[PDB]
């Protein structure tokens, strides 16, 4: 089999070596001429995989993470007999860890009990759906806004955006950025909705920048709004609003998803679908390819306060306050240097693991076991 | 014996029930009237154990674990044949953990490598000497200023203040507050010394308030001085200068030494001293009253980044950023409110353990074992 991968995609050889020959090219340097001897194509959201792009090539499999099934010509793939993988939630778990870390920072500045908060998750797909089950696993109140999922799941309990805004004191956004369609999400949080946020409400946005009206948010905070704000995604990336950032509790350069696992999981998931398509057993796993974690595990004694355990567990793996500190330093120069620094932070992002990889002994304590399980960490 | 103790002194029964009667009183309510029926006196800093208070009473032993020995009339004790104990170092290690947490916070904001700093420790007694041992154990560059110790230990490695202040870019202060003598420490850090600090220098003061000129510090920081500052001790306590505090990376209500085991060790050391004075064998020990840790331990894999391990281990036990958050909130009301809120945080300080009680597995990696031993954590 003859493989072509976008050069940015890691660990292609480890997964696909015994599968045939691998060739690697830049994303936009992959066109009609390159595809002439390609059986399996592995791309990101840069390379074109449309009818125009693919017709006349021996391409039988298209694998990606960055592109959703809304932006793949699946009717064409069916027509041409091309298999596909749009690996769901390649970098999803990392975002869940980031939100948890933000909530911990927020609870700490405020002296708040996280368990008494009312959570509102807008968008409950790969990321939001994972967040929801952590929060609920801990026994916390979660309101879920997801109109599409509501229409397909008549038995589930969903709420409207305006009820969520009415009842939630913690909001986390996890929708795509849709300008059009049935349920548009650009400035889903506009000035009137942001201005109506009750004093002491918390907001996390690690979806896409333009889901929140950044300029309205900045002015609302400058005006003295009583809020806690964590933003991982900004309206003009790599040019984040520096006066908005200065008013955010947590401000990071679109790195929420940037776990070590999340960068390699994309390749692993494509390979799994590729094995499922070919009807072959998997020869190499994500585990096989991941380096050993730095923190194997942690032991709690059964007297440990559950809330204390939660904060200790999450922060031992990842505290976004460290990324926040690096981001503040990136905002010191002129527009041009801030932009370059934004992208450099993302490129040189340090090795960061996921909470699901942490092994936790609890000494058999039930409330501690509940915390480990809700987090998705491993009981040992 | 007939024991009287400040009602806030813990575990007096466990250590003293076998010795006779035990009475308690609030600290400030202890005077010569109250001392008529007392052989063994156990106090805190809030009560004067003076010539006027002790004359005619049968008090033969005095024990204390608190801030300094200024409330004790040590000359009179030597005169009157009164045995005593200040339980030296009872609360020392909590301050060490506090300083480490400050350095971690400071490195994170500045993006600094802790291993590249030059550390100056001014005062190397119970606290400073412990700090020095940690810093040296990690292989870091350390300067020690302690003129009393140097004069008595002339073959030691000591340096003048002037030179320490010129060479060090991280200064931590651990002297007493002395107005007079050959080496007075009131405003040891004054306008000209503070002004001549190399740009980007970190200053930690968890000794006593008036060792640093708070007003001069505040004006320098307002004037744009390139410095990081961590203060646990303030001129005017409980009335911290809020404009100063706002410019400190870390600001806390004099709680550096408020670890749970410090309070227990105080009584336990006093008992050990009491047993020597009475010439009896020690029966009760700290282990008899010490609660189990909440966090038993952490397991590191051999490939763990040493610098990451240091930060993770320290913070897993205690991060003073949490106390800083609670302290920021205490600074919101009027003068009377801030003063009372300062004391409320000290009186109701949450349970907090010591880094020395942490058990760490390292997979036999030498660089990691070095970090664990330097920290004084338990290698397993
Ligand atoms: N910051 C990061 O590092 C990072 C990392 C990964 C993903 N993301 C972003 O997170 C967002 C969600 O990612 P995902 O993988 O979970 O996507 P997903 O498509 O799996 O889930 C999105 C959910 O949003 C719902 N939704 C759509 N419109 C909505 C609306 N108007 N109101 C409420 N819900 C709506 C959809 O039904 C879906 O369930 C995306 O914007 C993605 O780009 C960010
Ligand atoms: N913030 C807290 O919670 C907390 C807790 C414990 C102690 N403290 C304070 O920390 C300081 C030290 O405590 P300790 O128990 O280590 O006291 P200690 O007496 O054991 O040590 C003080 C050291 O300072 C040295 N010294 C004296 N004058 C000096 C000078 N001019 N320059 C340099 N060094 C000098 C002395 O020789 C001595 O070695 C005290 O002020 C104490 O009150 C604060």
UniProtKB/Swiss-Prot annotation, chains A, B:
Keywords: Cytoplasm, Disulfide bond, NAD, Oxidoreductase, Pyridoxine biosynthesis. It is an enzyme of class 1 (oxidoreductase). Disulfide bonds join 65-90. GO terms for cellular component: cytosol. One of its GO terms (biological process) is pyridoxine biosynthetic process. Pathway: Cofactor biosynthesis; pyridoxine 5'-phosphate biosynthesis; pyridoxine 5'-phosphate from D-erythrose 4-phosphate: step 2/5. One of its GO terms (molecular function) is protein dimerization activity. Substrate binds at residues 45, 66, 258. Its EC number is 1.1.1.290. NAD(+) binds at residues 126-127, 146, 175, 206-208, 232, 257. The active site is at residues 208, 237, 254. It is found in: Cytoplasm. PANTHER family: FORMATE DEHYDROGENASE 1. Each subunit can be divided into three discernible structural domains: the lid domain, the nucleotide-binding domain, and the C-terminal dimerization domain. PdxB has a unique dimeric structure among NAD-dependent D-isomer specific 2-hydroxyacid dehydrogenases due to the presence of its dimerization domain at its C-terminus. Belongs to the D-isomer specific 2-hydroxyacid dehydrogenase family. PdxB subfamily. Catalyzes the oxidation of erythronate-4-phosphate to 3-hydroxy-2-oxo-4-phosphonooxybutanoate. Homodimer. This is Erythronate-4-phosphate dehydrogenase. It comes from Pseudomonas aeruginosa (strain ATCC 15692 / DSM 22644 / CIP 104116 / JCM 14847 / LMG 12228 / 1C / PRS 101 / PAO1). The lineage of its organism: Bacteria, Pseudomonadati, Pseudomonadota, Gammaproteobacteria, Pseudomonadales.
């Amino acid at each position: 089999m003859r493989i072509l991968a976008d050069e940015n995609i890691p660990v292609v050889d480890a997964f696909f070596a015994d599968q045939g020959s691998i060739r690697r090219l830049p994303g936009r340097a992959i066109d009609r001429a390159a595809l002439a001897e390609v059986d399996v194509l592995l791309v990101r959201s840069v390379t074109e995989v449309s009818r125009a792009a693919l017709a006349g090539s021996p391409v039988r499999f298209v694998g990606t993470c960055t592109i959703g099934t809304d932006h793949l010509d699946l009717d064409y793939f069916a027509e041409a007999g091309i298999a596909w993988s749009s690996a769901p939630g390649c970098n999803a778990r990392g975002v869940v860890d980031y939100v948890l870390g933000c909530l911990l920072a927020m609870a700490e500045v405020r002296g708040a009990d996280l368990a008494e908060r009312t959570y509102g998750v807008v968008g409950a797909g790969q990321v939001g759906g994972r967040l929801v089950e952590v929060l609920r696993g801990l026994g916390w109140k979660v309101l879920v806004c997801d109109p599409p999922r509501q229409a397909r799941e008549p038995d589930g309990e969903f709420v409207s955006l305006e009820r969520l805004l009415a009842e939630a004191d913690v909001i986390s956004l996890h929708t795509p950025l849709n300008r059009d369609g049935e349920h548009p999400t650009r400035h889903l949080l506009d000035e009137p909705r942001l201005a109506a946020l009750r004093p002491g409400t918390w907001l996390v946005n690690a979806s896409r920048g333009a889901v929140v009206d950044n300029q309205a948010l900045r002015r609302l905070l400058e005006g003295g709004a009583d809020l806690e704000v964590a933003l991982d995604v900004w309206e003009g990336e790599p040019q984040a609003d520096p006066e908005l950032a200065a008013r955010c509790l947590i401000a990071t350069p679109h790195i929420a998803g940037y776990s070590l696992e999340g960068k390699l999981r994309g390749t692993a998931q494509i390979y799994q679908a590729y094995c499922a398509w070919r009807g072959i057993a998997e020869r190499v796993s994500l585990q096989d390819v991941l380096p050993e974690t730095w923190l194997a595990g942690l032991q709690l004694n059964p007297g440990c306060d559950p809330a204390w355990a939660l904060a200790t567990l999450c922060r031992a793996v990842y505290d976004p306050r460290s990324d926040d500190a690096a981001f503040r330093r990136s905002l010191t120069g002129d527009s041009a240097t801030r932009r370059a620094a934004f992208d450099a932070l993302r490129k040189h992002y340090p090795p960061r693991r996921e909470i699901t990889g942490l092994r936790v002994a609890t000494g058999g304590q039930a409330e501690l076991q509940r915390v480990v399980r809700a987090l998705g960490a491993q009981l040992v």
